[PDB]
Write a protein that binds this ligand. Structure first.
Ligand SMILES: NC(=O)C[C@H](N)C(=O)O
Ligand SMILES: NC(=O)C[C@H](N)C(=O)O
Ligand SMILES: NC(=O)C[C@H](N)C(=O)O
Ligand SMILES: NC(=O)C[C@H](N)C(=O)O
Lengths: 324, 324, 331, 329
């Protein structure tokens, strides 16, 4: 009989506005969760409960350490979380949890378990069952009958039950009458003792490229609050040839700022007149903004020089990008 | 015989392995299919200079709108050949600038140059011409990979695929197969009467993405001077962290007369916002894309309207860009 | 789809015919009803009241016959004036045939009739039974579409346009030639799908009686003899599952066999064996009638409906190509 | 899917069997291609077209035609680097499936393709499907019989024409595509099919009396009884969901009767996707067809019945993955 740890961090799934104790009170009135087929599980309600829209990077740290404390005593882990920033959390955990040897599944609901038509019970029951019977040792996100690689996800449909997507990678598992493991290529996986990397606050900016954007945007970030800049450029990584704009980017990099180029498109791979690259900009391949932002928080929090970080951002560390 | 005007503004479609004047036309001359008796007559106007759409500025939308105006009375339909990177921005801008449109305007292009192997250029162009002449829809539309989309509902969603564009919150208007079929997609508000083409003038607009760890400094920066409007790409149905400092900065922006509009950073979905942001003067952008919102702002800010009037208009369905 | 009033508490009638949803480890009388009594979500104030009529015996939908469609239609008629809507709990295997049959049998339908069920028993782990039934009841009470519909996996489909397309998925059903009528997410949204023909007045049930119908699949190597076989004795109609837009071998032997069949008064209907598409019509000269974009489910039940009426062959042939209940797209 | 070398100029053989692609409103197709510059670019492989006489609408095809095509491939196997079979769309999936079983030790690509609209008509997809097929055959030489359509390469014996009016006419319901084309040609991580070694061997496929029974409400035992009349060495049952049928006593008896007579009865799902999982039917001699398409099952039976195998061996082989047509447990 497997034993699963459930971290109830907050989110829509437990709301009525969140209220302490009602999530558990609800599960108690649902016998399906105590079936002989179901693994044993324990729920830890966080204090305070948070709407995921209020999440800060330090909150990823709290969750990572919570998993670390409970690691040896459980066979799997399920993180109940609000949907708004669930993809950011899943992504962060993938980098912070090195040599993960047990499944960590993040899930939640579009409708609170307290409201009618809720998807909370079904996503939670499935995450528990999957973590116990179809364990994949990576940080994953389960939603609407599919298990996705955490650092490949993004909330793509705000109003649908199929809220999340994995644009550049097929899901890892699908649920129907039976649970099927897909032939999705395993991510680089380290074996050995679990290593949990702590992170510290890091000022990062996210610039979206659009017709009429001026160099002032970049110049502003160069003010004082910035160690990295993420650019959401067009298609496979293009931006206007505006010389003034390019010069600001070059100056940003000369000051040790890590500038990464991503595509603003839902799916696609950046493939960079090689101006941007000449301006010191690093290509982020097919990484999501969610994975790039968290990857930066992770790398910037270590004792790595600017050039090492720039090189690591283009490498596949946890399966967040497709090489060459 | 219908007669179609083709504005060749530039883009991948006519490039070589870099853009070159006359190549596109020289290639089509060697393709008999285009002159078959079943095809409408068409004329190609090559722009000078040809542009990579990534270099497009709002004034370029104006040049195209005025070009359509000049040729309006002499053709039955219009096809705009354009680069894919910002095609959705141009399609969206034209929808607002061309009021009382009584002939079809179809924007299209290709992911691969007509000069390169496996090009989708000839097929997208052939289809746009045939559709404009035989299945006219009096709206600015975008044709790509056998589907015609409402222009101000499109976004480039797949950087590397032939199905590069999507219309996340609205079904296509028409689909091509053995037969061309018009879908039961509800028509957009459509004015009848003489064509009206509204010119636009440069407008400084900022686009801020909400993410864990974002600080009030960013908003404060745009307050510096380079901004008449600010677009927020918020979580899910329009949520953001409730950091008092961040919130106060947004409030000051609105007090200064800056139009702040809230959109979802998700591919699909509708914004629905106590209600902090709303109390901070932020306006809900419903299910509008960033492409439609940015161009709608350029359109409205260019007319002589009070900040009050602009704020109300942004949430109104002017050309079918949002669902009331 | 109309957005009905939620002012008063609705009363929905549930015809529990059997199916996976109420099984366990095999059907057990009373099991489903007890499970629902134990699930709080079904008894909230925002939910309509409902009454369950358990059929005896409960049936695996794979054992259903046209007689069973008749029984269900009569059950609906018997309770029509006493309830605000009807949900038919059914096995998935032939759910689409039942939904299609009811669309033709029920005339002047002024209340919703929604067929639903589940891929996994309401008991068993990971069941989709609770949600499909919960949604069906809620929709029946709040989005009163006056047609026979099928609800599954957050979508409401026009009954006579559906087919079970994915045997192992929770998204078991599809409506290949028509968009869904309604989709459920954080909010319940209606699609502007065009309306089906509607009558007026009290509900009328068009009964059916046994009709021998053959379903021949066209494949490489099939010959005229193969067809002559169906002309054995159990056939008043023949459904042809042809290639693409309605093509079949054009050799004279095969075509003469079809012409002889029609000369004997047999109604021969041409459909596409493809998941989606419309038949476009050779075969026509042989008396074959085009079935446009109808599903085999809709065509089979439409024939049972028409052949059971006192109509001459010519009238039935004409009616088969006409849109009677929204099962096909006219030119 | 292997990313082959582009070092030398490949030579691809094109078997023009007929179909919509070359139709008008003989020689027409070949002249059309000569007039299309794209097909003669230096980045393209050289190709030779063999026009069949007469050309055929794929709806008139029989098993003898699959044999004709197989013999044509064997005849030119050593002289070309790849093979593209131009074919009508209506039965393209049956031909691709048949060839997969017939061609043992296939060490070169064989790609079946065509178009929904004639090359002579405007809006045709013929040019792109053929150009892509030739390019894939020369640069991504997967050693299987595949089907190319609408920017995707599918395993032949896993395909079915699913959309009669769309350009995305074909689907592979139970298996992902092998390749997808966009700005770049991407290969999917699809498990390989069983492969032999040595010179190509063509197994004969001859006409075989096989009945295709669709299970539906009201179907009588007479149907099964009628098939047991003569045109039956095998019977394919298109059953409900994961393989269910009426528990009719007379029905089950006629079935057990068929298997007693040496008839191979295979159970498939009538659904677009899914896997059969039968129990009455099993105890009646019915063999489970897993997740095979009707197209793969029909041709697999033609293949096995045409070989030197007894009934017991054929029944066992039907549930085994011979060429990648089904997923093992
Ligand atoms: N989640 C994502 O990163 C999607 C898309 N690339 C964006 O820039 O928003
Ligand atoms: N084109 C779009 O607006 C998609 C998505 N809402 C974004 O913020 O990028
Ligand atoms: N349900 C259907 O009718 C699908 C498909 N046309 C078939 O012949 O089975
Ligand atoms: N092509 C196929 O086999 C699809 C479906 N299983 C049928 O019975 O037609």
């Amino acid at each position: 009989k497997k034993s699963i740890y459930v971290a109830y961090t907050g989110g829509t799934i437990g709301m009525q506005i969140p209220v302490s104790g009602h999530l558990q009170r609800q599960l108690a009135l649902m016998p399906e969760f105590h079936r002989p087929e179901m693994p044993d599980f324990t729920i830890h309600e966080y204090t305070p409960l948070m709407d995921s829209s209020d999440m800060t990077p330090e909150d990823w740290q709290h969750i990572a350490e919570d998993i670390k404390a409970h690691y040896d005593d459980y066979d799997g882990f399920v993180i109940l979380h609000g949907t708004d920033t669930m993809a950011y959390t899943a992504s962060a955990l993938s980098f912070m949890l090195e040599n993960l040897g047990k499944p960590v599944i993040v899930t939640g609901s579009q409708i609170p378990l307290a409201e009618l038509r809720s998807d909370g019970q079904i996503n939670l029951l499935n995450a528990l069952y999957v973590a116990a019977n179809y364990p994949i040792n990576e940080v994953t996100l389960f939603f609407n009958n599919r298990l996705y690689r955490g650092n490949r996800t993004a909330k793509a449909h705000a109003d649908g039950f199929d809220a999340f997507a994995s644009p550049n990678l097929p899901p890892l598992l699908e649920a129907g009458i039976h649970i099927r493991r897909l032939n999705t290529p395993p991510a680089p996986h380290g074996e050995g003792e679990l290593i949990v990397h702590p992170i510290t606050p890091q000022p990062i900016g996210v610039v979206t490229i659009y017709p009429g954007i001026s160099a002032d945007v970049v110049r502003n970030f160069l003010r004082q609050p910035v160690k990295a800049l993420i650019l959401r450029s067009y298609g496979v990584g293009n931006a206007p040839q505006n010389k003034a704009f390019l010069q600001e980017l070059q100056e940003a990099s000369d000051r040790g700022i890590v500038v990464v180029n991503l595509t603003q498109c839902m799916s696609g791979k950046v493939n960079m007149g090689n101006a941007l690259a000449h301006a010191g900009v690093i290509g982020g391949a097919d990484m999501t903004v969610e994975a790039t932002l968290t990857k930066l928080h992770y790398l910037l929090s270590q004792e790595l020089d600017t050039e090492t970080i720039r090189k690591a951002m283009s490498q596949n560390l946890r399966g967040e990008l497709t090489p060459d």
